[PDB]
Amino acid sequence: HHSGLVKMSHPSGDVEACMVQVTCGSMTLNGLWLDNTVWCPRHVMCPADQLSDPNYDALLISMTNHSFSVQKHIANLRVVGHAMQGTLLKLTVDVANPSTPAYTFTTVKPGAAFSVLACYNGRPTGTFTVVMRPNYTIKGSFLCGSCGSVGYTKEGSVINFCYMHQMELANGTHTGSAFDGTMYGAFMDKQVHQVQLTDKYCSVNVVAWLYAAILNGCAWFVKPNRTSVVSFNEWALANQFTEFVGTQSVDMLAVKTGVAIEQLLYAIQQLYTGFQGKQILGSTMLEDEFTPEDVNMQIMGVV
Amino acid sequence: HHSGLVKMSHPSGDVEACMVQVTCGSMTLNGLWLDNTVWCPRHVMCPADQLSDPNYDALLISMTNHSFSVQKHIANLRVVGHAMQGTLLKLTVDVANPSTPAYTFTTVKPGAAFSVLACYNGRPTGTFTVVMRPNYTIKGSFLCGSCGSVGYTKEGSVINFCYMHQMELANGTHTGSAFDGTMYGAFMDKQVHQVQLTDKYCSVNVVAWLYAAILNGCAWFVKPNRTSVVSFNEWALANQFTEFVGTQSVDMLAVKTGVAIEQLLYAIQQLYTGFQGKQILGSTMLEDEFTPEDVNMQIMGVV
Ligand SMILES: *[C@H](O)[C@H](C[C@@H]1CCNC1=O)NC(=O)[C@H](CC(C)C)NC(=O)OC[C@@H]1CCC(=O)N1CCC1CCCCC1
Ligand SMILES: *[C@H](O)[C@H](C[C@@H]1CCNC1=O)NC(=O)[C@H](CC(C)C)NC(=O)OC[C@@H]1CCC(=O)N1CCC1CCCCC1
Numbered sequence: 001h002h003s004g005l006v007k008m009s010h011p012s013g014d015v016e017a018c019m020v021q022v023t024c025g026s027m028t029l030n031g032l033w034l035d036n037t038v039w040c041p042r043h044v045m046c047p048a049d050q051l052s053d054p055n056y057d058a059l060l061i062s063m064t065n066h067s068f069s070v071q072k073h074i075a076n077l078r079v080v081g082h083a084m085q086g087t088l089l090k091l092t093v094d095v096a097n098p099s100t101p102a103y104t105f106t107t108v109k110p111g112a113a114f115s116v117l118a119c120y121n122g123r124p125t126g127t128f129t130v131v132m133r134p135n136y137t138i139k140g141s142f143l144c145g146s147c148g149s150v151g152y153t154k155e156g157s158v159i160n161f162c163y164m165h166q167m168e169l170a171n172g173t174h175t176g177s178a179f180d181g182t183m184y185g186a187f188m189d190k191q192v193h194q195v196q197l198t199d200k201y202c203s204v205n206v207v208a209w210l211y212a213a214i215l216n217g218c219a220w221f222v223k224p225n226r227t228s229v230v231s232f233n234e235w236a237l238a239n240q241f242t243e244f245v246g247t248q249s250v251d252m253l254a255v256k257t258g259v260a261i262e263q264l265l266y267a268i269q270q271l272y273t274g275f276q277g278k279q280i281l282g283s284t285m286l287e288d289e290f291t292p293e294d295v296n297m298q299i300m301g302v303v
Numbered sequence: 304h305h306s307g308l309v310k311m312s313h314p315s316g317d318v319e320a321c322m323v324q325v326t327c328g329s330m331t332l333n334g335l336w337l338d339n340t341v342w343c344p345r346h347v348m349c350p351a352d353q354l355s356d357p358n359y360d361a362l363l364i365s366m367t368n369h370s371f372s373v374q375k376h377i378a379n380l381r382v383v384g385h386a387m388q389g390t391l392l393k394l395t396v397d398v399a400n401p402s403t404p405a406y407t408f409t410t411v412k413p414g415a416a417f418s419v420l421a422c423y424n425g426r427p428t429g430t431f432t433v434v435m436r437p438n439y440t441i442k443g444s445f446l447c448g449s450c451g452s453v454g455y456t457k458e459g460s461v462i463n464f465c466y467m468h469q470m471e472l473a474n475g476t477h478t479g480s481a482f483d484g485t486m487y488g489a490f491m492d493k494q495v496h497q498v499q500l501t502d503k504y505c506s507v508n509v510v511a512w513l514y515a516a517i518l519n520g521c522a523w524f525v526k527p528n529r530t531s532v533v534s535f536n537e538w539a540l541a542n543q544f545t546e547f548v549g550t551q552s553v554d555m556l557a558v559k560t561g562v563a564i565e566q567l568l569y570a571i572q573q574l575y576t577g578f579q580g581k582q583i584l585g586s587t588m589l590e591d592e593f594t595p596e597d598v599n600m601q602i603m604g605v606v
Contacts, residue, residue, distance in 0.1 A: 002475035006310075006444040011420065011427040013316025117314065124314040127430060141309040141601045172305035172519070216475070284587055298444045 003216050003281045004299050005290055009115040009129045010154045016074065017099035021122025022091070022148065023069040030119040030148030031070060031091070032164065034100050038070050038077070038091040039179060041147045041166050042084055043189055051191040060084050073122045086181020087166065087189045101159050105179040108151070108162040110134040111202040111242065113291050116151045116163070118142065131205065131289050134242050135197035136185025137173035140165075151176070169196060203236055203244040203268065205288040210264045211253035212295045213280050219259070221280065226262035227269060235269060249292035256300060306519050306584045307602050308593055312418040312432045313457045319377065320402035324425025325394070325451065326372040333422040333451030334373060334394070335467065337403050341373050341380070341394040342482060344450045344469050345387055346492055354494040363387050376425045389484020390469065390492045404462050408482040411454070411465040413437040414505040414545065416594050419454045419466070421445065434508065434592050437545050438500035439488025440476035443468075454479070472499060506539055506547040506571065508591040513567045514556035515598045516583050522562070524583065529565035530572060538572060552595035559603060 022031040022040040026047060031040035043051065045059040045067075063082060068091055070077040081092030108114050110132050118126045118141065130138040130151070142149065142165055151163025166176040166189050175187050187194055214222065227235070233243040246261060254261055268286065275284045296302040325334040325343040329350060334343035346354065348362040348370075366385060371394055373380040384395030411417050413435050421429045421444065433441040433454070445452065445468055454466025469479040469492050478490050490497055517525065530538070536546040549564060557564055571589065578587045599605040 002442045004444055004475055006431040006433070006442070008421075008429040008431050008444055009312060011315045011319050011430055013314075013319040013427075016314050016316040118311075124316075126311040127314055128309040128311050130309070139305045139309070141307055141311055143601075143604045172307055298446075301446045 001216060001218075003212055005212055005281070005294065006298070007129050007289075008294065008298060009127045010152070012115070012117050012124065012127045014101045014159055015117050015150060015152060016124045018097060018101070019072075019074075019117065019119050019122055019124055019150075020077070021069075021071045021073060023071070024063070024067055028121065029145065030122055032148070032150050032161070033070070033072065033077070033093070033097045034103060036092055036094070036096050038079075038093055039164060040089050040091070041164065041177070041189065042087055042089045043147070043166075044089065053192075054190060056084065071122060074124070084181075087177045087183050088164065088179065088181045102157055103159045103161060106153070106160045106162050107178045107180070108132045108153070110136065111205055111288075111291065113294065114151045114153050114162055116140060116149060116165075118146055118149045120145045131202065131291070132184070133173070134200040134202065136187070137169055137175050137196075137199070138163075140174040142168060142174050167191075169194070171196060198240065201241045201286060202288040203232070203241045204247070204250065205291055206268055206286050207244065207250060207261060207264050208253065208292040208295045209281070209287040209290050210267060211250075211257055211259070211292075212290065212299055214257045214259055215253075215295070215299050216281065218280060220278065221267045221271060222259055222263055223266065224263070225266045226260060227266040228262055229265065232265040232269070239272060241268075247292060249296055252296055252300075252302065253292060304519060304521075306515055308515055308584070308597065309601070310432050310592075311597065311601060312430045313455070315418070315420050315427065315430045317404045317462055318420050318453060318455060319427045321400060321404070322375075322377075322420065322422050322425055322427055322453075323380070324372075324374045324376060326374070327366070327370055331424065332448065333425055335451070335453050335464070336373070336375065336380070336396070336400045337406060339395055339397070339399050341382075341396055342467060343392050343394070344467065344480070344492065345390055345392045346450070346469075347392065356495075357493060359387065374425060377427070387484075390480045390486050391467065391482065391484045405460055406462045406464060409456070409463045409465050410481045410483070411435045411456070413439065414508055414591075414594065416597065417454045417456050417465055419443060419452060419468075421449055421452045423448045434505065434594070435487070436476070437503040437505065439490070440472055440478050440499075440502070441466075443477040445471060445477050470494075472497070474499060501543065504544045504589060505591040506535070506544045506568075507550070507553065508594055509571055509589050510547065510553060510564060510567050511556065511595040511598045512584070512590040512593050513570060514553075514560055514562070514595075515593065515602055517560045517562055518556075518598070518602050519584065521583060523581065524570045524574060525562055525566055526569065527566070528569045529563060530569040531565055532568065535568040535572070542575060544571075550595060552599055555599055555603075555605065556595060
């Protein structure tokens with residue numbers, strides 16, 4: 001029986017209309033064009049021989065407005081100002097994007113999902129959705145030239161930009177910047193080996209997945225036994241789980257199914273020791289890539 | 304280690320601009336507006352009391368052009384002609400869609416992937432990618448009102464429309480129509496219980512996934528032992544696998560990794576009996592939802 005759950009991304013058209021190519025000397029990547037501003041990773045200023053130990057402050061001073069080229073491929077924009085904010089460049093152009101959507105900037109938190117528009121040379125090429133891992137990486141699909149690809153969520157008609165792609169880590173995962181210019185996690189935008197924080201199971205997302213299983217008639221793992229939130233969170237710290245924090249979205253699932261959160265916290269502790277040959281929604285391992293919001297929307301039609 | 308593989312959909316903007324709402328009496332769903340034509344499922348003509356045993360021929364005769372309303376939400380189109388082709392209606396409107404992309408119509412084959420734009424009331428709400436299963440269903444995410452949502456692939460700038468959503472099966476999976484009006488599989492657009500053909504593992508996609516594992520440095524399952532294509536396909540018929548048919552995309556992966564296809568056919572036969580506690584790209588079961596094309600594009604950057 002299919003759970004009715006897929007990896008669902010927002011329709012990407014609104015963001016496609018904001019994507020541009022930024023070139024600086026021998027370097028090129030993607031930028032995001034909103035109003036009179038173009039955001040892009042600052043290592044577009046770095047020549048290939050200094051990617052390991054860049055001096056971005058000196059690099060920025062060496063630039064003029066004519067050091068940058070901004071092109072929209074799907075118009076050439078004259079750059080009239082340039083500034084650096086953290087790991088991003090803010091270029092000012094003389095044309096406001098006529099397709100600028102209603103938007104804000106936000107930081108995404110571990111366990112939360114967002115949509116990514118992967119672009120190359122200013123051309124959108126694919127879209128997918130990821131969850132911010134507890135170690136502030138994402139399990140993405142990014143190749144050379146993808147930097148400046150953007151991640152976002154959408155509230156109503158308002159796009160909430162939360163990610164701009166910067167780099168691939170040694171374990172194949174990815175990270176980038178929020179639009180305040182801070183890198184997610186402790187990462188730096190330099191091409192050197194960097195310490196990787198341990199990843200964890202996202203407990204709230206595992207709980208959501210188990211509710212999705214109940215909503216599909218799969219509840220063999222549900223017992224009257226209960227583990228309290230405080231008891232589970234002590235257990236989580238010793239077992240590579242995030243501490244559980246309940247939300248209204250989770251409570252809706254408890255109300256719909258009639259299964260208490262603490263019943264699923266107990267089930268998680270037992271299932272972590274092993275599924276014993278049984279499957280939950282086609283899986284023999286805990287799934288934490290679906291949020292409570294995903295389950296409410298895709299299965300219950302609740303937004 | 305992350306494989307670098309995600310469920311990747313095409314950017315949906317080109318298709319969002321073609322989506323409309325179609326209303327017929329008390330029924331409403333989505334349509335696809337291309338040139339002067341609007342395609343939509345024919346059961347928009349059915350009142351709720353006849354969804355089990357509809358007479359679409361008599362229903363169509365009872366309609367006039369003014370029986371239909373077509374609205375674009377993200378202009379109201381006057382309907383000037385109506386016709387039925389299989390399980391779809393072809394409405395003719397008096398305005399050509401100014402955002403009509405270059406397009407064709409095609410039928411997708413089992414094992415092949417395509418992008419879906421899920422819409423409600425003519426408003427796109429999400430995008431995801433699915434593989435046509437060997438029993439001509441897809442493992443989608445569709446709720447009431449999603450009918451007329453469209454599936455497509457993209458070759459260059461040309462959109463290849465291949466699916467229009469029609470119904471949910473008893474096991475939670477989904478099916479719909481090609482744009483020649485034929486339903487995928489043996490399914491009928493009536494709200495009755497229908498025979499479900501058995502699903503199968505898509506062997507060519509499993510082979511692609513094992514190549515992706517090798518490309519990520521995971522090759523413990525590779526042995527000098529080989530099973531021929533003809534020998535495997537005899538085995539497949541007795542073990543719920545599709546018969547393997549090689550392609551140029553698969554051959555590229557063999558050339559890149561230096562591992563022969565027949566080596567992976569042997570590995571599949573052994574892995575089908577059990578992973579013996581080991582994992583491949585984070586999984587303890589065979590994965591068939593990634594195509595050879597997905598692996599070539601996402602990992603090797605080859606399109
Ligand atoms: C920008 O388009 C680019 C996106 C990358 C390319 C491959 N996949 C991506 O997501 N970003 C970069 O190339 C980064 C530029 C820096 C921040 C100045 N660097 C980066 O992503 O380096 C990836 C390399 C290659 C694999 C790996 O482990 N790794 C990490 C850096 C470091 C290099 C030296 C050896 C230890 C690891
Ligand atoms: C159109 O928007 C709609 C899309 C559906 C709604 C739920 N998810 C979807 O993908 N399509 C329909 O409602 C179909 C209309 C027919 C083709 C005239 N019917 C349909 O999808 O029926 C689904 C029902 C409910 C679950 C189930 O097993 N099933 C199959 C039909 C039949 C009904 C009678 C009892 C046995 C199963």
